[PDB]
Every structure is written in C-alpha cells, then in structure tokens.
Amino acid sequence: SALGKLQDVVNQNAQALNTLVKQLSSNFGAISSVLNDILSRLDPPEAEV
Amino acid sequence: RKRISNCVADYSVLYNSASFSTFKCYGVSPTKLNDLCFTNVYADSFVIR
Amino acid sequence: GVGYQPYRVVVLSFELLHAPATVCGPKKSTNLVKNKCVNFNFNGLTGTG
C-alpha cells in the first residue's frame, strides 16, 4: 500500500469509465436499452419516443 | 389460447387483409413484424361485444 | 347495432429476445461471412461487427 495515492487515481478513473459503460444498459423508461432492438420493432414515430 | 411455434409466420397478409376492423400493434410495428423472430407466439381468440 | 354485435377478437402476444427463437418471418437466410465488418442478423438480432 505504499503507492496507494497513485492506485487511487487509477481505480477512480477505471470505476468512472466502468459506470459510464454500465449506464448503456439502462432503459431510462424506454421499452429496451438496445437501439437496434428499438429500431427493428418500431416504425419512426413510435421509435422516436 | 393456442400455441404457435416452430413455424414461419407471414404477417403481411394479415396486415393487408382489409376485412379486419381493428389492426393495432403495441410493442412492434406491423410493417416490421415480418423481420422479427419470437420464442413463442400465443394467439388468444374470443367473441365479445 | 354496431357496438352490440358479436365481434371476433384475436390477440397476438409474443415474447421478444430472451430465449432461442422458434417463430420467424419469411426472410431468406444468407451465407456466413467471417473476418469482415458486416451487418449481421441472427434471429432478428440486428448489429454490426
């Protein structure tokens, strides 16, 4: 744990990136979290929402 | 309730058949219905007012 | 009169994208191409890679 000061920076950046990536799995109220899935099932005006 | 499985479904004819009074789809558009694959289709039929 | 006559109603309830698919639209399958950036479509799973 001598280099914990640098390890903390590395871990914080990696954790922020991982959270940003994981945020792509959230529906945010939509039917699906996959853009291709939304576009494959719905025509433009329903898919727009 | 009828199990529909292990078959190729062509919804284009059903969409084009004008005899239906109501053709409303909720989670998919009828035009895109011919490009999707489902793990199970359950068709429920009844007579109501 | 209209609104009181018998009506034959059929619903089409299906599940999307959790298990292997068994009901598919009438789209002809194509060949498999590897080691190339392609627009794949596996049982309705549209993507690029």
Residue of chain B with shortest Cα separation from C12? B43
Which of B35, B40, B31, A46 minimizes the C-alpha distance to C46? Answer: B35
Residue of chain C with shortest Cα separation from B26? C13
What sign results for the dihedral spanned by CA atoms A20, A26, A30, A34?
positive
* Chain A residues with CB-CB distance to B38 below 8 A: none
Residue ranges of C 1-49 with Cβ closer than 8 A to chain B: 3-16, 18-27, 43-44
Which of A38, A30, A14, B26 minimizes the C-alpha distance to C17? Answer: A38
Q: Which residue in the block uniquely carries the two structure tokens 């062509």?
A: B10
The Cα A43–Cα B4 span in angstroms is 25
- Coil/strand/helix, residue A35: helix
- Coil/strand/helix, residue A19: helix
> How many C-beta neighbours within 10 Å does residue B49 have?
7
The Cα A21–Cα A13 span in angstroms is 12
Please check whether residue C25 is in contact with residue B33, taking contact to mean a CB–CB distance below 8 angstroms: yes
Please check whether residue C14 is in contact with residue B47, taking contact to mean a CB–CB distance below 8 angstroms: no
Distances (CA, A) of C13 to A16, A21, C30: 40, 33, 28
CB contact under 8 A, A42 and B29: yes
In Å, what resolution does this model reach? Answer: 2.7
Residue of chain C with shortest Cα separation from A36? C46
The Cα A5–Cα A7 span in angstroms is 6
The approach used to solve this structure was: cryo-EM
With 0-12 / 13-18 / 19 or more C-beta atoms within 10 angstroms meaning exposed / middle / buried, residue C22 is: middle
CB contact under 8 A, A40 and B29: no
> Which of A27, A36, A38 is the best residue to mutate to test the C interface, defined by the most C CB atoms within 10 Å of its own CB?
A36
